[PDB]
Paper text:
To assess that phosphotransfer from REC-1 domains was being carried out on the phosphorylatable H105 of Ct_HPt, we generated the mutant H105E and conducted phosphotransfer experiments with REChHK6 and REChHK3 in the presence of PAM. The absence of electrophoretic mobility shift for the Ct_HPt mutant H105E in the presence of PAM, compared to WT, alone or upon incubation with the REC-1 domains indicated the absence of phosphotransfer and confirmed H105 as the only nucleophilic residue to become phosphorylated. We determined the structure of the phosphomutant Ct_HPt H105E at 2.4 Å which showed a similar structure than Ct_HPt in the complex (rmsd of 0.7 Å for 125 residues). However, the superposition of the phosphomutant to the complex showed few clashes with residues of REChHK6 involved in complex interactions, thus, supporting that subtle changes in the side chain conformation of a few residues could prevent phosphotransfer. In relation to HPt, we have observed subtle changes in the phosphomimetic mutant H105E.
Residue numbers in the entry: 44 to 173
Write the structure that this text describes.
Amino acid sequence: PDFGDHVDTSIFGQILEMDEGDDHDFSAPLVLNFFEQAEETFQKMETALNNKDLPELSKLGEFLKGSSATLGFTKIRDSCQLIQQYGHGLNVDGSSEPDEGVCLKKIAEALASARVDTVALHKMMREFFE
């Protein structure tokens, strides 16, 4: 399976080992569970944006970063890392960003990237598991 930059094959590959037989009896429910979880998190983020709660956004980013990391979903993990950082009021270089308005705008961009990358991956994973 050639998922491009979306998936770390060395990590995802280890998920696939847990399948007994060729029906993907373990990996497929797991991946499904991740997309549901992601979808829930994105909704809770979309609300957190609406209420301009930067700490919440930071934590949701960190949470979803961790679960995408576990499965090797690199592009999603990265965008969630940015949400974590911008939620703590920091730029990519580590310098502080004191303008909340700027932070929120950067989070919005990274949330859009995350959602789009999730959808892209969901499709490929659907092709893969059929």
